[PDB]
Paper text:
The exosporium is a prominent bipartite structure comprised of a paracrystalline basal layer and an external hair-like nap. Each filament of the nap is formed solely by a trimer of the collagen-like glycoprotein [name]. One of these proteins is [name] (also called ExsFA), which is required for the attachment of approximately 98% of the [name] present in the exosporium. In this process, each filament of the nap is attached to a basal layer surface protrusion that appears to be formed by a trimer of [name].
To further investigate the nature of the [name]-[name] attachment, we determined the crystal structure of [name]. Although it was confirmed by mass spectrometry that the protein used for crystallization contained all 167 residues (data not shown), the structure included only residues 20–167. The crystal structure displayed a trimeric assembly of [name] monomers. Each monomer folds in a jelly roll-like structure composed of two antiparallel β sheets, labeled A and B, containing six and five strands, respectively. β sheet B includes two β hairpin motifs. A novel feature of the [name] crystal structure is a bound calcium ion hexa-coordinated by oxygen atoms of residues Asp87, Ser89, Glu94, and Thr153 located on neighboring β turns. The top view of the trimeric structure shows that the β sheets of each monomer form a tight core within the trimeric structure. The crystal structure of [name] also suggests an orientation for [name] trimers within the basal layer and a mechanism for [name] attachment to ExsY. Although the first 19 residues of [name] are presumably disordered and thus not visible in the crystal structure, the position of residue Thr20 suggests that these disordered residues are most likely positioned at the bottom of the structure shown in Fig. 1B. In either event, the region of [name] proposed to interface with the [name] NTD is comprised of three loops, two of which are involved in binding Ca2+. Although the crystal structure of the [name] trimer resembles that of a trimer of the CTD of [name] in several ways, [name] trimers are much less stable than [name] CTD trimers when treated with heat and detergent. On the other hand, when [name] trimers are incubated with a peptide containing residues 20–38 of the NTD of [name], they form a complex with an apparent molecular mass of 55–65 kDa that is as stable to heat and detergent as either [name] CTD trimers or [name]-[name] complexes extracted from spores.
Author numbering:
A (entry chain A), B (entry chain A), C (entry chain A): 20 to 167
């Protein structure tokens, strides 16, 4: 049987990060020639991916983060993957960024990869858990791929 | 059947990013003890990987990017994976970096992971699509692994 | 047969980077609901993962790096995965970060993904190979997943 997988992303709609608020991931169709959902036995719900098949999964997320130092300097965010409710964070999935206190204009990329046992009904989302300032998420992506 | 895969990288030759110009990836042999091509039913062409087998693929890329703020400040780059011609970018694969307008010396890492349906003949490359300044790509890497 | 895999991380104990000294990765159990080792035919040794099964592996690492510019500015680190002894670095796995020479407070994420042929007894670890200053590794993670 082909492994379960899913890919959800936001390529064209920046969003500001809010505490314990899952990032929006409206798209599932990355190939520009044969443009179809890259989904097999998972469900993209609009802010993440729901597992339908118990198994071991490799999960990645990638964020492009603009910390322009307005209206406060520095700006910072700490992000995790969450299982179910947004506060139910996954240790091992955390990443964090912070700008310099001087100047303006920094844009950074955070990406993380984990492996995790998951079960039917588990909802995987990207959640900001600590924020300073207005943290602009220019793009976001979430990959889920069963190891089998 | 073993999944198709390929790994192409540039570990020892920095290159400046140019618009719509695929990054050079001359090496395929990462193990320092048993130093062999990590290639199975793909082809490394020198600036990316060509697919030979239809399937679902997890693709990653990793870049170490020096934005020294010379000759302009800030410096910035936006990168995507491309399918076929360099302008045929893959939504969901984008990353971007930008230095502070003040000071000098920033070096950043961008990494992205996607899942994508691909077909025989598809050529996957890393492409800069927007640039400010002289963006020094100190190291680059591209992984392609079929999910099957 | 299910692919070999392992996940080792450090979520709750920052460590400063030292030359040729593998980063500490004490945890293997990321799911907060069903909290179990995500290990199959590998061994987590406390500073990395030992391979038990010959095969092709996708390996990732993710670091959250604080470069506060004290006691020197800038601060910088270059990291690789190592095979066996810490100086036996894997070309293609390198990443590097450096702060601005001005100001303070930068926190960056580095993540890298490779594919590699590996053999029983191979020990995979994350190693700093060049350092400037006191480079604070706030969190670290290492994924190993056989492609089969
Ligand atoms: Ca802001
Ligand atoms: Ca420059
Ligand atoms: Ca320091």
């Amino acid at each position: 049987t082909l492994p379960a997988f899913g890919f959800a992303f936001n390529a064209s709609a920046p969003q500001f990060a809010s505490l314990f608020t899952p990032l929006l991931l409206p798209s599932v169709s990355p190939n520009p020639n044969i443009t179809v959902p890259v989904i097999n036995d998972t469900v993209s719900v609009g802010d993440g991916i729901r597992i339908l098949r118990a198994g071991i999964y490799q999960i990645s997320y990638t964020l492009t983060i603009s910390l322009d130092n307005s209206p406060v300097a520095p700006e910072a965010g700490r992000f995790f993957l969450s299982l179910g409710t947004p506060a139910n964070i996954i240790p091992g999935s955390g990443t964090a960024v912070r700008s310099n206190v001087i100047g303006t204009g920094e844009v950074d990329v955070s990406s993380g990869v984990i492996l995790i046992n998951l079960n039917p009904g588990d909802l995987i989302r990207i959640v900001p858990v600590e924020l300073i300032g207005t943290v602009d998420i220019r793009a976001a992506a979430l990959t889920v791929a069963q190891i089998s």
